[PDB]
Short mmCIF file of C-alpha atoms in Angstrom, two decimals:
data_model
loop_
_atom_site.label_atom_id
_atom_site.label_comp_id
_atom_site.label_asym_id
_atom_site.label_seq_id
_atom_site.Cartn_x
_atom_site.Cartn_y
_atom_site.Cartn_z
CA UNK A 1 95.18 176.19 -68.71
CA UNK A 2 96.87 173.07 -70.16
CA UNK A 3 94.46 170.80 -68.27
CA UNK A 4 91.69 168.68 -69.83
CA UNK A 5 88.10 169.80 -69.49
CA UNK A 6 86.15 167.17 -67.59
CA UNK A 7 82.53 166.74 -66.53
CA UNK A 8 80.86 163.94 -64.61
CA UNK A 9 78.73 161.60 -66.76
CA UNK A 10 75.96 161.98 -64.14
CA UNK A 11 75.77 165.76 -64.56
CA UNK A 12 72.25 165.76 -66.05
CA UNK A 13 70.63 163.88 -63.18
CA UNK A 14 72.58 165.94 -60.63
CA UNK A 15 71.40 169.16 -62.26
CA UNK A 16 67.78 167.97 -62.51
CA UNK A 17 67.61 167.06 -58.80
CA UNK A 18 69.72 169.94 -57.47
CA UNK A 19 66.77 171.76 -55.84
CA UNK A 20 65.44 168.98 -53.60
CA UNK A 21 68.20 169.36 -51.00
CA UNK A 22 68.16 173.17 -50.46
CA UNK A 23 64.34 173.12 -50.37
CA UNK A 24 64.16 170.39 -47.72
CA UNK A 25 66.74 172.32 -45.66
CA UNK A 26 64.78 175.58 -45.97
CA UNK A 27 67.54 177.35 -47.90
CA UNK A 28 65.18 177.98 -50.84
CA UNK A 29 61.60 178.82 -49.90
CA UNK A 30 60.10 180.44 -53.02
CA UNK A 31 59.74 179.43 -56.66
CA UNK A 32 61.50 182.67 -57.60
CA UNK A 33 64.49 181.80 -55.41
CA UNK A 34 64.52 178.31 -56.95
CA UNK A 35 64.75 179.85 -60.43
CA UNK A 36 67.47 182.26 -59.30
CA UNK A 37 69.32 179.21 -57.95
CA UNK A 38 68.93 177.28 -61.22
CA UNK A 39 70.34 180.24 -63.16
CA UNK A 40 73.59 180.06 -61.19
CA UNK A 41 74.69 176.81 -62.82
CA UNK A 42 75.88 175.31 -59.54
CA UNK A 43 75.29 171.62 -60.27
CA UNK A 44 77.08 172.21 -63.57
CA UNK A 45 80.01 173.72 -61.67
CA UNK A 46 80.02 170.77 -59.26
CA UNK A 47 80.02 168.25 -62.12
CA UNK A 48 83.20 169.92 -63.42
CA UNK A 49 84.90 170.20 -60.02
CA UNK A 50 84.04 166.52 -59.42
CA UNK A 51 83.91 164.74 -62.80
CA UNK A 52 85.02 161.55 -61.00
CA UNK A 53 81.87 161.56 -58.83
CA UNK A 54 78.41 160.22 -59.65
CA UNK A 55 75.24 159.65 -57.68
CA UNK A 56 75.12 160.66 -54.03
CA UNK A 57 78.83 161.55 -54.07
CA UNK A 58 78.18 164.08 -56.82
CA UNK A 59 74.99 165.26 -55.09
CA UNK A 60 77.14 166.16 -52.08
CA UNK A 61 79.29 168.23 -54.42
CA UNK A 62 76.20 169.87 -55.90
CA UNK A 63 74.96 170.70 -52.40
CA UNK A 64 78.33 172.24 -51.51
CA UNK A 65 78.19 174.55 -54.53
CA UNK A 66 74.53 175.27 -53.75
CA UNK A 67 75.37 176.06 -50.12
CA UNK A 68 78.38 178.19 -51.08
CA UNK A 69 76.34 180.71 -53.04
CA UNK A 70 73.28 180.62 -50.78
CA UNK A 71 75.67 181.31 -47.89
CA UNK A 72 77.68 184.06 -49.59
CA UNK A 73 74.42 185.82 -50.49
CA UNK A 74 73.67 186.37 -46.78
CA UNK A 75 76.58 188.86 -46.64
CA UNK A 76 75.66 190.90 -49.72
CA UNK A 77 73.75 193.36 -47.52
CA UNK A 78 74.59 195.19 -44.29
CA UNK A 79 75.75 192.05 -42.44
CA UNK A 80 78.85 191.88 -44.62
CA UNK A 81 79.76 195.47 -43.70
CA UNK A 82 80.60 194.94 -40.03
CA UNK A 83 82.62 192.01 -38.65
CA UNK A 84 80.52 191.58 -35.49
CA UNK A 85 77.36 190.68 -37.40
CA UNK A 86 79.29 188.57 -39.92
CA UNK A 87 80.90 186.65 -37.05
CA UNK A 88 77.57 186.15 -35.30
CA UNK A 89 76.32 184.16 -38.30
CA UNK A 90 79.59 182.36 -39.12
CA UNK A 91 79.98 181.17 -35.52
CA UNK A 92 76.54 179.54 -35.76
CA UNK A 93 77.51 177.78 -38.98
CA UNK A 94 81.03 176.83 -37.85
CA UNK A 95 79.59 175.36 -34.63
CA UNK A 96 78.44 172.41 -36.76
CA UNK A 97 82.07 171.26 -36.91
CA UNK A 98 82.14 170.87 -33.11
CA UNK A 99 78.92 168.90 -32.60
CA UNK A 100 75.18 168.85 -33.29
CA UNK A 101 73.49 172.21 -33.81
CA UNK A 102 70.55 173.50 -31.76
CA UNK A 103 67.27 173.33 -33.65
CA UNK A 104 67.20 177.14 -33.35
CA UNK A 105 70.19 177.49 -35.70
CA UNK A 106 69.48 179.33 -38.97
CA UNK A 107 68.67 177.12 -41.97
CA UNK A 108 71.99 177.99 -43.62
CA UNK A 109 73.70 176.41 -40.58
CA UNK A 110 71.66 173.20 -40.67
CA UNK A 111 72.43 172.96 -44.38
CA UNK A 112 76.17 173.23 -43.80
CA UNK A 113 75.89 170.66 -41.00
CA UNK A 114 74.18 168.22 -43.37
CA UNK A 115 76.97 168.72 -45.90
CA UNK A 116 79.67 168.38 -43.25
CA UNK A 117 78.00 165.28 -41.80
CA UNK A 118 78.18 163.65 -45.24
CA UNK A 119 81.70 164.97 -45.94
CA UNK A 120 83.24 163.38 -42.84
CA UNK A 121 81.55 159.97 -42.94
CA UNK A 122 83.89 157.25 -44.17
CA UNK A 123 87.01 159.42 -43.99
CA UNK A 124 89.82 159.07 -41.47
CA UNK A 125 89.45 161.18 -38.30
CA UNK A 126 92.66 163.02 -39.20
CA UNK A 127 91.23 163.93 -42.61
CA UNK A 128 88.05 165.18 -40.92
CA UNK A 129 90.03 167.30 -38.44
CA UNK A 130 92.11 168.83 -41.23
CA UNK A 131 89.03 169.55 -43.36
CA UNK A 132 87.34 171.08 -40.31
CA UNK A 133 90.29 173.47 -39.94
CA UNK A 134 89.93 174.47 -43.60
CA UNK A 135 86.29 175.35 -42.96
CA UNK A 136 87.22 177.41 -39.89
CA UNK A 137 89.79 179.24 -42.01
CA UNK A 138 86.99 179.92 -44.50
CA UNK A 139 84.59 181.29 -41.89
CA UNK A 140 87.37 183.29 -40.21
CA UNK A 141 88.11 184.77 -43.63
CA UNK A 142 84.57 186.09 -43.95
CA UNK A 143 85.02 187.91 -40.63
CA UNK A 144 88.40 189.28 -41.74
CA UNK A 145 86.96 190.68 -44.97
CA UNK A 146 83.99 192.22 -43.15
CA UNK A 147 86.51 193.87 -40.80
CA UNK A 148 87.95 195.53 -43.93
CA UNK A 149 84.69 197.49 -44.34
CA UNK A 150 98.13 192.03 -52.03
CA UNK A 151 94.64 191.25 -50.70
CA UNK A 152 95.43 187.54 -51.10
CA UNK A 153 95.74 186.86 -47.36
CA UNK A 154 91.99 187.31 -46.89
CA UNK A 155 90.82 186.18 -50.34
CA UNK A 156 92.79 182.91 -50.27
CA UNK A 157 90.42 181.78 -47.49
CA UNK A 158 87.11 183.32 -48.61
CA UNK A 159 87.29 181.93 -52.16
CA UNK A 160 86.49 178.50 -50.70
CA UNK A 161 88.85 176.52 -52.94
CA UNK A 162 90.35 174.33 -50.21
CA UNK A 163 87.01 172.91 -48.96
CA UNK A 164 86.12 172.42 -52.63
CA UNK A 165 89.32 170.42 -53.09
CA UNK A 166 88.65 168.65 -49.79
CA UNK A 167 85.26 167.53 -51.08
CA UNK A 168 86.84 166.09 -54.24
CA UNK A 169 88.69 163.61 -51.99
CA UNK A 170 85.47 162.66 -50.21
CA UNK A 171 83.57 162.50 -53.51
CA UNK A 172 86.33 160.29 -54.92
CA UNK A 173 86.44 158.20 -51.71
CA UNK A 174 90.22 158.60 -51.46
CA UNK A 175 92.64 160.60 -49.33
CA UNK A 176 95.96 161.99 -50.52
CA UNK A 177 98.72 160.90 -48.10
CA UNK A 178 98.46 163.38 -45.25
CA UNK A 179 102.21 163.89 -45.12
CA UNK A 180 102.16 164.79 -48.81
CA UNK A 181 99.24 167.18 -48.30
CA UNK A 182 101.44 169.04 -45.81
CA UNK A 183 104.45 168.95 -48.14
CA UNK A 184 105.89 172.23 -49.37
CA UNK A 185 105.33 171.04 -52.95
CA UNK A 186 101.65 170.19 -52.57
CA UNK A 187 101.17 173.36 -50.53
CA UNK A 188 102.55 175.37 -53.45
CA UNK A 189 100.26 173.52 -55.87
CA UNK A 190 97.22 174.23 -53.69
CA UNK A 191 98.24 177.87 -53.37
CA UNK A 192 98.33 178.11 -57.18
CA UNK A 193 94.88 176.52 -57.38
CA UNK A 194 93.59 179.09 -54.87
CA UNK A 195 95.29 182.03 -56.60
CA UNK A 196 94.07 181.04 -60.08
CA UNK A 197 90.48 180.67 -58.87
CA UNK A 198 90.33 184.07 -57.16
CA UNK A 199 92.01 185.80 -60.12
CA UNK A 200 89.61 184.28 -62.65
CA UNK A 201 86.78 185.17 -60.29
CA UNK A 202 87.71 188.86 -59.97
CA UNK A 203 88.03 189.13 -63.76
CA UNK A 204 84.52 187.73 -64.28
CA UNK A 205 83.26 189.88 -61.38
CA UNK A 206 83.72 193.36 -62.92
CA UNK A 207 80.17 194.55 -62.03
CA UNK A 208 88.63 193.30 -56.41
CA UNK A 209 92.14 192.40 -57.61
CA UNK A 210 91.85 194.97 -60.42
CA UNK A 211 93.34 198.06 -58.74
CA UNK A 212 96.36 192.16 -68.41
CA UNK A 213 98.85 191.63 -65.60
CA UNK A 214 96.40 189.26 -63.90
CA UNK A 215 96.16 187.09 -67.03
CA UNK A 216 99.96 186.79 -67.08
CA UNK A 217 99.96 185.83 -63.40
CA UNK A 218 97.46 183.06 -64.14
CA UNK A 219 99.75 181.87 -66.95
CA UNK A 220 102.95 182.12 -64.89
CA UNK A 221 101.32 180.28 -61.98
CA UNK A 222 99.97 177.53 -64.23
CA UNK A 223 103.40 177.07 -65.80
CA UNK A 224 104.85 176.79 -62.30
CA UNK A 225 102.03 174.39 -61.43
CA UNK A 226 103.36 172.04 -64.12
CA UNK A 227 106.91 172.25 -62.73
CA UNK A 228 105.54 171.41 -59.29
CA UNK A 229 103.64 168.46 -60.77
CA UNK A 230 106.90 167.14 -62.23
CA UNK A 231 108.40 167.06 -58.71
CA UNK A 232 105.67 164.71 -57.47
CA UNK A 233 107.45 161.43 -58.41
CA UNK A 234 110.41 162.49 -56.27
CA UNK A 235 108.10 163.86 -53.55
CA UNK A 236 106.50 160.42 -53.34
CA UNK A 237 109.86 158.75 -52.76
CA UNK A 238 110.91 161.40 -50.22
CA UNK A 239 107.81 160.49 -48.18
CA UNK A 240 108.21 156.77 -48.98
CA UNK A 241 104.74 156.30 -50.42
CA UNK A 242 103.59 152.77 -51.11
CA UNK A 243 101.58 151.79 -54.15
CA UNK A 244 98.15 152.76 -52.81
CA UNK A 245 99.56 156.07 -51.56
CA UNK A 246 101.13 156.85 -54.93
CA UNK A 247 97.77 156.13 -56.58
CA UNK A 248 95.87 158.29 -54.09
CA UNK A 249 98.37 161.11 -54.64
CA UNK A 250 97.81 160.73 -58.38
CA UNK A 251 94.03 160.83 -57.92
CA UNK A 252 94.50 163.96 -55.80
CA UNK A 253 96.55 165.59 -58.56
CA UNK A 254 94.08 164.80 -61.35
CA UNK A 255 90.65 164.64 -59.66
CA UNK A 256 91.03 167.32 -56.97
CA UNK A 257 93.74 169.89 -57.77
CA UNK A 258 93.52 169.90 -61.56
CA UNK A 259 89.72 169.79 -61.49
CA UNK A 260 89.43 172.77 -59.15
CA UNK A 261 91.77 174.73 -61.45
CA UNK A 262 90.15 173.78 -64.76
CA UNK A 263 86.55 173.40 -63.62
CA UNK A 264 86.04 177.02 -62.61
CA UNK A 265 87.51 178.18 -65.93
CA UNK A 266 85.20 176.00 -68.04
CA UNK A 267 82.24 177.00 -65.85
CA UNK A 268 82.89 180.73 -66.36
#
């Protein structure tokens, strides 16, 4: 991974305060669960996904990593074995994208809603709508994988890389030009980011894509990622980006796409 390792300078404070949010939302209710949460290294992971964020912006990234693993743990048992029960929970979480949740919603849903509320604020409506679709793809992917009980079609959505990348924009208080986000070149870059994350995850998860060749695919995809990066100057002219748009595209390349590729590696 020819990308620099980066970590937010506010990582220590973010890690020290990481428990206050999931406790106030009822996601962590016992001292033992708090310690199990601390052992995951989730604030550390967030500080590497979002080295450009500090303070509340980084706290939102910490909470997303916190929520990710608290959420995924709810499907480790029987619920993850049938799609109907998986969907019953995911629909309650995903409903937060469409409006306020009933007070009766499970705590994991109110926690997501508090993340999503903070994610959207200050971003363009079109960015919000696109990020909301990425979430729905993520929740729909959990139902697809439960219905299963080249696996990339399901895993590319359940790995949660795109909402991670989305949050890097919000945490950096910038948006990549929407027409460049939809570009075939950026789409290929994001697909590499997703594929590298799920490959590195299945390797560290031997306790699955294993069914040597995976390490070469990570290397081939990262070499292609560099080629795709070299096309970005011409992509910017094709879409007639102005100066601020070229800078936002550059921030997206370095603080969102590169970070999500490198950060998971350094965290593992």
